Structure formats: structure tokens, C-alpha cells
Amino acid sequence: DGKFPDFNRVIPLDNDKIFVLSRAELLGALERVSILANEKFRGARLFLQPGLLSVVCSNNEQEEAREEIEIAYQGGELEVGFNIGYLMDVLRNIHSDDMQLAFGDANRSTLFTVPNNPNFKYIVMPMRI
Amino acid sequence: LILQAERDSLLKPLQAFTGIVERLHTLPILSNVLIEGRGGQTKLLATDLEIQIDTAGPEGGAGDFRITTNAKKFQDILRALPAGALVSLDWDDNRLTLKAGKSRFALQTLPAADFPMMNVGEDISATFSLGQERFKTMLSQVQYSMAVQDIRYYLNGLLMQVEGSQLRLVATDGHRLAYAACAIDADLPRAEVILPRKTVLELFKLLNNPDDPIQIELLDKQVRFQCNGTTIVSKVIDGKFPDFNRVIPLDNDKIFVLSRAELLGALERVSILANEKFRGARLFLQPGLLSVVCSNNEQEEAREEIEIAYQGGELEVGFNIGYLMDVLRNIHSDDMQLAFGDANRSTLFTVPNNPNFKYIVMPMRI
Amino acid sequence: LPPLGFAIAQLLGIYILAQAEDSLLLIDMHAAAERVNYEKMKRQRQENGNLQSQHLLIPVTFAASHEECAALADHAETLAGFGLELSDMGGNTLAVRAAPVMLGKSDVVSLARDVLGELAQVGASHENRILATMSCHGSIRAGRRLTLPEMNALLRDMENTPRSNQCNHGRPTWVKLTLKELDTLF
Amino acid sequence: PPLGFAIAQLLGIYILAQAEDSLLLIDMHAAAERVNYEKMKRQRQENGNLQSQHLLIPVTFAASHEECAALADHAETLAGFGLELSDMGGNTLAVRAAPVMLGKSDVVSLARDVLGELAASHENRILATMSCHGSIRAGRRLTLPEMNALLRDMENTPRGRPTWVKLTLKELDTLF
Known part of the structure; x- marks a missing residue:
């Protein structure tokens, strides 16, 4: 019994940095890089540059893990932090081949969608790592 | 650059160093696996100051090196990689750089000088070998009777005794005893060791080549098992095992053979309505019939009956149902032979026409 | 029941x-x-x-000083009354076949030795050996x-x-x- | 011969x-x-x-109340018999060391004999009372x-x- 939040103000509308990449490959990369991340809060940094997406993680013991993925991207660079659990959950629970990632700036919502599937939306807001 | 090899060629040898490696030991380096490259060959080592296991690793290594790196992180990184990817290990100061595709991992390493090694004895008293499947079968037949953390440390283990051409495995907790034996192609002086439970479990994991044999060497308070390119060295539980010959009854005249699967199913069905603190089950043995009865606090009763080729006098006897189900599960024979004395004396569980396995349980007065 | x-x-x-x-x-x-x-x-x-008795696997290797064997030769009915039934193995050794329940769990040799050395000098007639002398097991040490x-x-x-309140001392x-x-x- | x-x-x-x-x-x-x-x-x-021998995993007796005080009485006699034993707590004790030439046994029995003899002087409790071990029975x-x-x-x-x-x-x- 209660009023659920209005999800319309939630969803971003102007995310310009859009690229589509393999769901399985990105999920495997996130699983690999999360091994050497801090085990409690799991800060993962994504570096987005034309043609490359890099995922970097680090932990208490000054250890670092880094993976890279080739993507069809040409826009501006963007460094954005995330709680890797939120990134991994959608990739685990979605059974589509490709996923479309839309970024605005590193301070606001990131949109996860399935190409040619207007019925599914997933919004995560970043941390400052 | 210190090493370069395929993923599985590194991952598989590491999987022999997980049970022994304590994820949180008081010594930090004990959480690390030791990697040693020498003469174009790689060796992987691990220990807990009590069980030391080593094996051969990949071969694509240029130069000699000795490092220790965190076992869990390294193994998780290896298993997270695609099965068939190339892995390159570089060494930079106190760091190990793992490279696979577009994946980098900057692990921190500890010097191999601080990695502890067991001062393995040089006093081999007996050496033999036997089929891995046979040894694994014997260990499975005897392991469930070991006492888990008893006040007597020698019962918290498995007695391995070689005498003449006979190898015997004995386990007991004080309320039951499992004895297994086999013929070994050797003539050895009577020796005996008490393998700790951790050694028993690691050895159980090790035996994965049923067609190949395993070599066992008895040392000065040590046992070394060698097989599949893997060597395990373990300290023994010092002390004297109970003389298993007194334990085995020789006068249980109420003998009958019945299907093991039938009795196991009966016990599993009737245990559901058994008392939770005591977990007792009453066996009613009468000519032609064996009844398994259980009852609980809530005035509920479960009862199953089994046709038996039995002739002798009646007997009501209580048993701890876990003891019965242990032997009924860990023996893979079709039939089992039950030998009963009287209500307050031991019961013998055997495999018909198989003198090499014996199992003794005392009853409980239910 | 609080x-x-x-x-x-x-x-x-x-x-x-x-x-x-x-x-x-x-x-x-x-x-x-x-x-x-x-x-x-x-x-x-x-x-x-x-006392309630119980048998057990794996007898104890008593080692049975000389006259304690003769004390066992004296009526072992009282020993069965203390829950301790034991047998002679030969020479001057023994082994307990049954220990009293409520103690168990180790060192039955001490209990049997206490009661059997008490079987010397028949008079019994005290019965206060069932105390800490026979309770020389307690719980787990x-x-x-x-x-x-x-x-x-x-x-x-x-x-x-x-x-309850005041112990043996x-x-x-x-x-x-x-x-x-x-x-x-x- | x-x-x-x-x-x-x-x-x-x-x-x-x-x-x-x-x-x-x-x-x-x-x-x-x-x-x-x-x-x-x-x-x-x-x-x-006697020649002492320290041993692994000591055995803990039971240690009736006055026997603990007898251990409080000079334990150097017990060490003279090759028996070093400590108090674990409550009213229980454990042999950290046992005499050689007797070694594996019901070490509790030897310790109990020598400790219950402490109810002075004498010397011949080293006989069959201490040889209450002998060989294996x-x-x-x-x-x-x-x-x-x-x-x-x-x-x-x-x-x-x-x-x-x-x-x-x-x-x-x-x-x-």
C-alpha cells in the first residue's frame, strides 16, 4: 500500500553517446575485471573513446585489472564510474545478442536498451570513483 | 616476461591447490600459490604447513623464476578467461602482469624466500603402488566412519596399515568401525600411519585417473602420495590406532542377506518420521521379515517391511539411522549381509562373498 | 519453562x-x-x-595391578551394580566390556580402577565412592x-x-x- | 642365548x-x-x-579437587618421576610430559598413582604401582x-x- 515513484522523470532523454556492443562479451569483460576490484563496493571505471571501451578496476592491495572492447563509436570521450553489480545484473538477466548503451555525461543517467526492442529500458546512475 | 601458455594448461594444475590453501590463514603468504620456473619447466606448489601439494605446470616459460601470488585471485582470473586464450605472465618488481587478449591483471606478489616448505623426511620405510580406482573405492568405503574432532586425536583420521601383501584401511569414531582391505603386489614390513581427515579429502579429490596407479611411500611421520604428475606430502596423526581385530564380532549368528537399495530406500522413507534429537530406528528381525520402525515426539510413526531369506530367532534392535545410511550409501553393491548377535552387542555389515569389507555398529537402547 | x-x-x-x-x-x-x-x-x-550400564566397541587395555584381578575374582556382581562389567584377558590385565552411562567419553580405565581398588578389603559398607571418586569423569574435562x-x-x-548453590566445597x-x-x- | x-x-x-x-x-x-x-x-x-619425554596432544585426566592442590604441592617430585603436568582449569590437569620406558599407556593412571600418593617421604611407589604400565597389557x-x-x-x-x-x-x- 503506497504510491510508487513516477518513472517518467527517471528516464533520460538526451543521452548522445550511443553505441551497441555484444552483451555476452561485455558481461564477460565485467566479470573478469571485477575480480581485482574492491570486494565490498566495486567501483568500475569505463573509458569511452572512438572505437574503444575500457573497463578498469582496482582494490585495496594496489592491484588493477583492465579490459578493452572494440566498438562502433565515433563521438567524444567519457570517463564514467559505476557499481559493477548494476552493470552485470542486466547483462545476466537479458538474453539478447546485442545491447545499446547511451551515455550523457558522467554525472547523470545511463540508458541500457535492446536494439529494435522498444519495450525494455534500464537506467543506472553513476558513482564518482 | 616470465611465462606464456594456454589458459587450461595453467588452470588445471592450480585446481589441485584449493582445499589445502587456506583462504584466511594467519600467515599471509600461506594464501599464495608458489610458481617456480626452472629448466624450461613450471612447477606449482601449495601448502598449509601440514599438507604440501606440488605438480608440474605448463612448459612455455623462458628463464628461471620463483614467485608467490594470491591463489584465489589468480585461479578466478584464469577460470574467467575464455577456454583457449593465451596467457602471458610478466614480472615487474613486486607485481605479476597477466595478459590475455585485451585483458590486463596487475597482481601483487610475495617473494618465494618466505614461502614455507615441509622438511620432508628421507627415511622411506615402505613403498607400494595400487590402482587409483581400487584405492578410491577403499577410501570411499571407510571414510564415513572417521570421528570429526573427537577428544582422541587418533580417531580424527584414517588408519592405513600395510602388512605382508595386504593393505588395510580402518576408520572409527567409537560407535562404529569401517574396515577395508585389498591385496598389494608387494611384501612389506608391518607399518601403519594415521592419515588426517584433510589428507583423506585431498587424496580423495586427487584420484581421478582410475586406470593409472598411485604410489604410496611411508616416511618418518610423513606419507607421500605420487600419481598423475602430482605429489602430496602429509604429516601423520601421531599415536596408536585401536586394534581393529578386537572390534570385529565373530559370533553374530543371526545372518541374512537383503537388497542394499531396498533397505536404503526403507530407511530414507522412515527417517522422515523419526525423533529429531535421537534419530533412532528400530529393526524388528523375525523369520522371513525385517521391519524398520521410526517414531517422533508428535505421536507419528513410519514403518516399512522387507521380505528376507531369514530363518533364525527374533531380535529387536535400535540403531542410529545415520550410521546405517552411511554404509548403505557408500557401498555400491547390490546386496548386503547383516549379522546380528543379541540386542546389546555389535552388528556386522558385510558384502556377500566379499571378505575384504567389514562394518560394525553398536546398537542404541531405544 | 524460562x-x-x-x-x-x-x-x-x-x-x-x-x-x-x-x-x-x-x-x-x-x-x-x-x-x-x-x-x-x-x-x-x-x-x-x-547403575545404568552400556557396552561398547574397542575395550580399554586396563593393565590391572595384581590384586585387582583377584578383586574381580571376588563377586563381580557389585561391579555390575556400579555399571562396570569387565573381563580378564590373561596374566594380570583386564578390559572393560561395559561402562556406566552418564559418564562415558573417555578414561573408563580410571573409573574401573577406582571401583576395583575399592573392591579390596570387603566390609561396600560405605557407598560414598560414587562421589567425585566415581564421578572422576564429570563432563568433558x-x-x-x-x-x-x-x-x-x-x-x-x-x-x-x-x-545446586553450594558445590562440593x-x-x-x-x-x-x-x-x-x-x-x-x- | x-x-x-x-x-x-x-x-x-x-x-x-x-x-x-x-x-x-x-x-x-x-x-x-x-x-x-x-x-x-x-x-x-x-x-x-627419571628421563622425561614431552609428547604431542596431552591427555587430560579429571583431577579430583584435592589432587589439584597436590599438584600445587611441589611438582618437582612429579618431574623427578619424569611426569610434568599442568592445570588446564576448573579441576582438570594434563600431562605435558611422560616418562620414557613407559611412553604410550594410560598415562592418566601413572600420573594418578603418583599424584594420589601425595596425601611425604617413602620411595617405593616406583614399583608395580608405577609399573602399572609394564609392557602393553x-x-x-x-x-x-x-x-x-x-x-x-x-x-x-x-x-x-x-x-x-x-x-x-x-x-x-x-x-x-
Whole structure:
């Protein structure tokens, strides 16, 4: 019994940095890089540059893990932090081949969608790592 | 650059160093696996100051090196990689750089000088070998009777005794005893060791080549098992095992053979309505019939009956149902032979026409 | 039944701590169990005239000093009355085939030796060897009391069994700390 | 030679040794009790104490209340008998060390004898009271090589039942 939040103000509308990449490959990369991340809060940094997406993680013991993925991207660079659990959950629970990632700036919502599937939306807001 | 090899060629040898490696030991380096490259060959080592296991690793290594790196992180990184990817290990100061595709991992390493090694004895008293499947079968037949953390440390283990051409495995907790034996192609002086439970479990994991044999060497308070390119060295539980010959009854005249699967199913069905603190089950043995009865606090009763080729006098006897189900599960024979004395004396569980396995349980007065 | 307490754990080897409505209580397991074992053994002795027996796997290798074998040659009916049935192996050794229940768990040689050396000088006629002399097992001396679903069973020691407050000397066997242990934090 | 050469054992209590005369039945527990008594007294008059041996996983007795205070009484006597034992807590004790030449046993029994004797003076509780261990009672009967070492019992040692020969073909009269 209660009023659920209005999800319309939630969803971003102007995310310009859009690229589509393999769901399985990105999920495997996130699983690999999360091994050497801090085990409690799991800060993962994504570096987005034309043609490359890099995922970097680090932990208490000054250890670092880094993976890279080739993507069809040409826009501006963007460094954005995330709680890797939120990134991994959608990739685990979605059974589509490709996923479309839309970024605005590193301070606001990131949109996860399935190409040619207007019925599914997933919004995560970043941390400052 | 210190090493370069395929993923599985590194991952598989590491999987022999997980049970022994304590994820949180008081010594930090004990959480690390030791990697040693020498003469174009790689060796992987691990220990807990009590069980030391080593094996051969990949071969694509240029130069000699000795490092220790965190076992869990390294193994998780290896298993997270695609099965068939190339892995390159570089060494930079106190760091190990793992490279696979577009994946980098900057692990921190500890010097191999601080990695502890067991001062393995040089006093081999007996050496033999036997089929891995046979040894694994014997260990499975005897392991469930070991006492888990008893006040007597020698019962918290498995007695391995070689005498003449006979190898015997004995386990007991004080309320039951499992004895297994086999013929070994050797003539050895009577020796005996008490393998700790951790050694028993690691050895159980090790035996994965049923067609190949395993070599066992008895040392000065040590046992070394060698097989599949893997060597395990373990300290023994010092002390004297109970003389298993007194334990085995020789006068249980109420003998009958019945299907093991039938009795196991009966016990599993009737245990559901058994008392939770005591977990007792009453066996009613009468000519032609064996009844398994259980009852609980809530005035509920479960009862199953089994046709038996039995002739002798009646007997009501209580048993701890876990003891019965242990032997009924860990023996893979079709039939089992039950030998009963009287209500307050031991019961013998055997495999018909198989003198090499014996199992003794005392009853409980239910 | 709001009891004495509800056992929560062990304490470094000799105490068992139990939480109740008041605080955690430190029961000296050996002392309290000696009290309750003496009480139960005497209650089971005044009734049925003998102690409850139990047999067991793996006899004990007694080693049986000379005249103790002759004491066993003397009527072992009393030994069966103390719950200890034992047999002669040869020369001057013995082995116990049955130990009394309520003790078990090790060192049965000490119990049998106590009662059998008492069998010298028949007069009996004292019966106060069933005390700490025969209660020279108590509970576990310093090793293990299971994983808790038996600790509460000893925590039920003094329910329906008298002689609780004052032990064999007067030393307390339980509570000292109350909920106001915050003073210790200063 | 003399006293024979051990060939086997008889049901658990005897060790029969072959000599030029005949085979001799040695009561192994009694013979070992006598030899241990002699060895302990020889090691007692010289060096003034028995040879101690620390052991792994000590055994904890039970330790009746006044026996703990007897341990509070000078424990150097117990160390003189080769018995070092500590108090674990409550009213229980454990032997950190046991005498050699007795080693594996119901060490609780030896410690209990020497501790309950502390109810002063005296010396001869080192006899069968301390030799309440002897050899292994009726089992384990270690094989012929050390059986001969046991057959060297009265060698180097003097000194109440006899522990040897009866075979003079009297068993022949018993069977013929």
C-alpha cells in the first residue's frame, strides 16, 4: 500500500553517446575485471573513446585489472564510474545478442536498451570513483 | 616476461591447490600459490604447513623464476578467461602482469624466500603402488566412519596399515568401525600411519585417473602420495590406532542377506518420521521379515517391511539411522549381509562373498 | 519453562556461557556436571539398586595391578551394580566390556580402577565412592561440548536435582555477571 | 642365548623362545614389569630422576579437587618421576610430559598413582604401582625382533611370580 515513484522523470532523454556492443562479451569483460576490484563496493571505471571501451578496476592491495572492447563509436570521450553489480545484473538477466548503451555525461543517467526492442529500458546512475 | 601458455594448461594444475590453501590463514603468504620456473619447466606448489601439494605446470616459460601470488585471485582470473586464450605472465618488481587478449591483471606478489616448505623426511620405510580406482573405492568405503574432532586425536583420521601383501584401511569414531582391505603386489614390513581427515579429502579429490596407479611411500611421520604428475606430502596423526581385530564380532549368528537399495530406500522413507534429537530406528528381525520402525515426539510413526531369506530367532534392535545410511550409501553393491548377535552387542555389515569389507555398529537402547 | 539460561557458547576450555533474561552466565562445566552426575547416580542407586550400564566397541587395555584381578575374582556382581562389567584377558590385565552411562567419553580405565581398588578389603559398607571418586569423569574435562544442541542439556542440570548453590566445597559453579557489566567498560 | 630366541607368542600373554634346551614361555607383561622396575630404580639412584619425554596432544585426566592442590604441592617430585603436568582449569590437569620406558599407556593412571600418593617421604611407589604400565597389557605384542629385546629382560637386571620355563615335556604327559 503506497504510491510508487513516477518513472517518467527517471528516464533520460538526451543521452548522445550511443553505441551497441555484444552483451555476452561485455558481461564477460565485467566479470573478469571485477575480480581485482574492491570486494565490498566495486567501483568500475569505463573509458569511452572512438572505437574503444575500457573497463578498469582496482582494490585495496594496489592491484588493477583492465579490459578493452572494440566498438562502433565515433563521438567524444567519457570517463564514467559505476557499481559493477548494476552493470552485470542486466547483462545476466537479458538474453539478447546485442545491447545499446547511451551515455550523457558522467554525472547523470545511463540508458541500457535492446536494439529494435522498444519495450525494455534500464537506467543506472553513476558513482564518482 | 616470465611465462606464456594456454589458459587450461595453467588452470588445471592450480585446481589441485584449493582445499589445502587456506583462504584466511594467519600467515599471509600461506594464501599464495608458489610458481617456480626452472629448466624450461613450471612447477606449482601449495601448502598449509601440514599438507604440501606440488605438480608440474605448463612448459612455455623462458628463464628461471620463483614467485608467490594470491591463489584465489589468480585461479578466478584464469577460470574467467575464455577456454583457449593465451596467457602471458610478466614480472615487474613486486607485481605479476597477466595478459590475455585485451585483458590486463596487475597482481601483487610475495617473494618465494618466505614461502614455507615441509622438511620432508628421507627415511622411506615402505613403498607400494595400487590402482587409483581400487584405492578410491577403499577410501570411499571407510571414510564415513572417521570421528570429526573427537577428544582422541587418533580417531580424527584414517588408519592405513600395510602388512605382508595386504593393505588395510580402518576408520572409527567409537560407535562404529569401517574396515577395508585389498591385496598389494608387494611384501612389506608391518607399518601403519594415521592419515588426517584433510589428507583423506585431498587424496580423495586427487584420484581421478582410475586406470593409472598411485604410489604410496611411508616416511618418518610423513606419507607421500605420487600419481598423475602430482605429489602430496602429509604429516601423520601421531599415536596408536585401536586394534581393529578386537572390534570385529565373530559370533553374530543371526545372518541374512537383503537388497542394499531396498533397505536404503526403507530407511530414507522412515527417517522422515523419526525423533529429531535421537534419530533412532528400530529393526524388528523375525523369520522371513525385517521391519524398520521410526517414531517422533508428535505421536507419528513410519514403518516399512522387507521380505528376507531369514530363518533364525527374533531380535529387536535400535540403531542410529545415520550410521546405517552411511554404509548403505557408500557401498555400491547390490546386496548386503547383516549379522546380528543379541540386542546389546555389535552388528556386522558385510558384502556377500566379499571378505575384504567389514562394518560394525553398536546398537542404541531405544 | 524460562530456565537457568540458554547456552550460547564455550569459554576458552572450562566454562560454558549461557544467555538468559538477566545476562550471560558462566557455568563451570566440570563442577556442575560433577554435581549433577553425583546426584543422578545416587538417585539411580537408591532405585533399582544398580547403575545404568552400556557396552561398547574397542575395550580399554586396563593393565590391572595384581590384586585387582583377584578383586574381580571376588563377586563381580557389585561391579555390575556400579555399571562396570569387565573381563580378564590373561596374566594380570583386564578390559572393560561395559561402562556406566552418564559418564562415558573417555578414561573408563580410571573409573574401573577406582571401583576395583575399592573392591579390596570387603566390609561396600560405605557407598560414598560414587562421589567425585566415581564421578572422576564429570563432563568433558577441557575438550568439546558439541555444537550447542547438547549444551542446554547440561544447562538443565539443577532442574529437579538438588544441591545446586553450594558445590562440593562452596565454590560457585555459575553466574557472577549481570546486565550491568558496562562498568567493566570504564 | 641364553634364555632362548623368541619365535612366537601364545594367545596374547606368552612369548615362547627357542633355546638349545627347549622353548620357554615368558610372561611378557610380568617380565617387562620386572625389567622396567629395575631400569627405573637404576635410573633413580643415578641422576636422581627419571628421563622425561614431552609428547604431542596431552591427555587430560579429571583431577579430583584435592589432587589439584597436590599438584600445587611441589611438582618437582612429579618431574623427578619424569611426569610434568599442568592445570588446564576448573579441576582438570594434563600431562605435558611422560616418562620414557613407559611412553604410550594410560598415562592418566601413572600420573594418578603418583599424584594420589601425595596425601611425604617413602620411595617405593616406583614399583608395580608405577609399573602399572609394564609392557602393553595383552595386545600389540610387537614382533620377533623386539621380542628378543624383551627376551634380554633379566640380562643386566637382577630381581613375585616366576616369568619363564615350564616346558619339560610335561605338556607331553598332559597330552600322552
